[PDB]
Amino acid sequence: MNATIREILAKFGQLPTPVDTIADEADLYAAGLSSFASVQLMLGIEEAFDIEFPDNLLNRKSFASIKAIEDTVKLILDGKEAA
């Protein structure tokens, strides 16, 4: 999921910079990650594996580190129907 999450920015995300330069240990907003790019990320990432990023982690430092946010989306899978 984690690699997939940063990957989608290439095909759906309106990022004004190639995803090649960014990583999970890098701050995506440095590449020009806009709220436009992130919302497109949601729409595609949902169908991509299962669900999209909920508000609880959306308005949060999570996007500053993919490996961090990916764990938070993983816990969703742990109990989706229990949320």
Cβ atoms within 10 A of the Cβ of 35, count? 9
CA gap 29, 34 in Å, rounded: 7
User: Per the structure, how many domains does the chain have?
Assistant: 1
Which residues form the domain of 48? 1-83
SS3 54: coil
SS3 81: helix
Contact status, residue 8 vs residue 48, Cβ threshold 8 Å:
yes
Q: Is the dihedral of CA 40, 49, 80, 74 positive or negative?
A: negative
CATH of the domain at 17: 1.10.1200.10
Contact status, residue 83 vs residue 50, Cβ threshold 8 Å:
no
Cα dihedral 39, 43, 45, 46, rounded to 10, equals: 130
Q: Which technique was the structure solved with, according to the deposited record?
A: NMR
